[PDB]
Amino acid sequence: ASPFRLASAGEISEVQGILRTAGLLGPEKRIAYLGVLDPARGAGSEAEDRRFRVFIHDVSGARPQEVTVSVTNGTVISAVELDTAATGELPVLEEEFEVVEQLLATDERWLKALAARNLDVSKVRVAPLSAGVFEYAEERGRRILRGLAFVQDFPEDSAWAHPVDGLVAYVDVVSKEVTRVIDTGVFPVPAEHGNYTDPELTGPLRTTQKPISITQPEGPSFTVTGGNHIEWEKWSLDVGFDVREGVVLHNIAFRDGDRLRPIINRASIAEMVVPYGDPSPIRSWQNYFATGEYLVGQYANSLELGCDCLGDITYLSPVISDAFGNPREIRNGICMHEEDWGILAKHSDLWSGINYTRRNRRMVISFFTTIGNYDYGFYWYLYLDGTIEFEAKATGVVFTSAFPEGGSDNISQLAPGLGAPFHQHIFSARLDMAIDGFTNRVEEEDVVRQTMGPGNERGNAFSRKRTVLTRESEAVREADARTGRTWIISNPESKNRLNEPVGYKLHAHNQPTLLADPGSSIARRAAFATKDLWVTRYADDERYPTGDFVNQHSGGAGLPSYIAQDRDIDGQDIVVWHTFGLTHFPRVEDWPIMPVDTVGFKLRPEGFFDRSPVLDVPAN
């Protein structure tokens, strides 16, 4: 009966029925997004009304709509017509990916470009990439996708090994017409194949790896109730799933003695953008928001036991809607398990003669998604000591291009004639804080060096300083690794036994943020990625750092607009948005399939407890 329970296949089927009956789901309509709405602030309203938010696309060219329906009452709460040229286009439909390659296949300009390169059109795959917004005036209001070509020699061939550079096309997926085909010149299509399962490339497989058996003879230490409510080593939370954000953690709390203390109300990766840094007109427009434009949850993989998740795994199989409102189950799309995490605490004391050692553990909640050539793993970790951590694992096949004769300052060579354009993978973690309640505040903590002199005659002293962020206008912060800068979220009304406000400290990896020029389209559309940390006043409609309709939006939506309200965040219901990412200069080692690389962040208790919260852990 939990208001945070996962959507059922029936609920999605009910939304479909409601929409159809209301006349909002005709033959020309398509569901571009469908997700359950979280309970509003204030559970005073007995029995929560299960509501779903829906983005309805019209393949006829008619205006799309944002609809809210109550599955509890079987009614349409609201239906608003959208002006895409103003507020942005709806997310890309899976069924739209195909149209790009199919439409180009009969376009004379495209066929001529391929003929010149002696490429069989039946062997040319086309990657359907988001368009963004640039100098093409005829695109505003129009739903466009840009296509880049790759040759697939045979059904099981990895097309990524054969990019067709010097060629790009733009297509209007609704009017179904190729608006433009640009051919800047022929580039040799890389010849070597990148088939990592081909013995000629892998060579003899290793026979040196002995098995590692990870088991739990008495089962897991965590309990799953209500389908998605998790309880593990004092932790309490609800694992939700949204087609846009993927796995979302709700009501993260820690049982400290006799009371369940909240830490974070909602944690999610609210956006993920991959900006490319190759100035070639063939790719200079390339920026794909996996979350905002494509909806990462939608492409979550079914995780195979023993391969994707090892040990004693408890799966969750979330259900999403297809383009027509039919429920589709993502079998084993979410993995949950606990794993040993080395030494937790250790000390051999000479004076007391007591030797003490305790092991650590982490609760893991994860899912893996595939976006064309890339595959991303999203992992949330809960540690015994109260630490919360997120880790993104980037793998898959690198997006390729030709490697220019004479080299390049924006592309690396991975194989003969094969290039890999420089790019970044930048995430935004939206953390709706609730440190011992909703009355929170954020402080920027910097290490402070001291000069040798009076009060510090030996010049050994060093300190720290904390600055409270009181208004949103001063809540857009940058990292400063040199000064060990961190951010503390505390509750000025809840103090520990030492009369100090309880808190949690966010430790960032301090990786580079968005590198693009400040005046670029991407810097405007993904402004969140230009700064490491943002703090906003909580608001029901401020869900994504990039706004609700990212696709082809002119820019400034999301965080820049929210922050413009300059609201009070000093001891209020606030939300922390942390930007973190990888800057990728592909290596030869990343080809033909790249080894996982990682990035993340974590929050550790900072005077939240009255002493170590793991003194009750057994020797085992």
The residue (of 21 and 302) whose beta carbon lies closer to its own copies is: 302
For position 456 contacting its own copies by CB under 8 A, the verdict is yes
Q: Which one of the spans 41-49, 225-233, 262-270, 584-592 is the region binding Cu ion (CB under 5 A)?
A: 584-592
**Which of 88, 386, 547, 558: binder of its own copies (CB under 8 A)?**
386
For position 283 contacting Cu ion by CB under 5 A, the verdict is no
CA dist., res. 359 & res. 235, Å (int): 17
For position 430 contacting Cu ion by CB under 5 A, the verdict is no
What's the min distance (Å) between Cβ of 399 and Cu ion? 8
Residue with tokens 């030494």: 343
- The mark string for 292-331 relative to its own copies (x by CB under 8 A, - otherwise) is ---------x--x-xxx-xx--------------------
Question: Is 546 in contact with 557 (CB distance < 8 Å)?
Answer: yes
What's the min distance (Å) between Cβ of 125 and its own copies? 5
Half-sphere exposure for 417 (CA within 13 Å, toward CB): 14
**Which of 4, 288, 367, 422: binder of its own copies (CB under 8 A)?**
422
The CA-based angle 547-548-553, given to 5 degrees, is 65
What's the min distance (Å) between Cβ of 4 and its own copies? 23
Of these partners, its own copies, Cu ion, none, which one is at the site of residue 346 (CB under 5 to 8 Å by kind)?
its own copies
How far is C-alpha 83 from the chain's CA centre?
A: 27
Neighbouring-strand partners of residue 78: 68
Question: Is 121 in contact with 149 (CB distance < 8 Å)?
Answer: no
For position 516 contacting its own copies by CB under 8 A, the verdict is yes
Of these partners, its own copies, Cu ion, none, which one is at the site of residue 305 (CB under 5 to 8 Å by kind)?
none
**Which of 63, 329, 449, 467: binder of its own copies (CB under 8 A)?**
449
- The mark string for 22-61 relative to its own copies (x by CB under 8 A, - otherwise) is ----------------------------------------
Token reading at 55:
């983005």
Q: Which one of the spans 13-21, 172-180, 435-443, 505-513 is the region binding its own copies (CB under 8 A)?
A: 505-513
Of these partners, Cu ion, its own copies, none, which one is at the site of residue 596 (CB under 5 to 8 Å by kind)?
its own copies
Segments of 322-455 assigned E as strands: 327-329, 334-348, 355-371, 374-383, 388-396, 401-402, 411-415, 418-421, 423-433, 441-449
What's the min distance (Å) between Cβ of 587 and its own copies? 6
Of these partners, Cu ion, its own copies, none, which one is at the site of residue 584 (CB under 5 to 8 Å by kind)?
Cu ion
- The mark string for 191-210 relative to its own copies (x by CB under 8 A, - otherwise) is -----xx---xxxxxxxxxx
How far is C-alpha 588 from the chain's CA centre?
A: 26
For residue 419, give the amino acid letter.
G
Single out the residue of 555, 562, 592 nearest to residue 577, CA to CA.
562
For position 10 contacting its own copies by CB under 8 A, the verdict is no
Dihedrals phi, psi of 577, to nearest 5 degrees: -120, 110
The residue (of 55 and 380) whose beta carbon lies closer to its own copies is: 380
For position 618 contacting its own copies by CB under 8 A, the verdict is yes
What's the min distance (Å) between Cβ of 425 and Cu ion? 5
Give the number of other CB atoms < 10 A from CB of residue 561.
Answer: 12
Token reading at 24:
């909002």
Burial status of residue 48 (CB atoms within 10 A of its CB: 0-12, 13-18, 19 or more): middle
Dihedrals phi, psi of 556, to nearest 5 degrees: 85, -10
The site for its own copies, by CB under 8 A, has a size of: 153
CA dist., res. 585 & res. 414, Å (int): 11
- Subset of residues 142 to 181 that bind its own copies, contact rule: CB under 8 A: 152, 155-159
**Which of 143, 368, 584, 591: binder of Cu ion (CB under 5 A)?**
584
The residue (of 6 and 388) whose beta carbon lies closer to its own copies is: 388
CA dist., res. 225 & res. 233, Å (int): 15
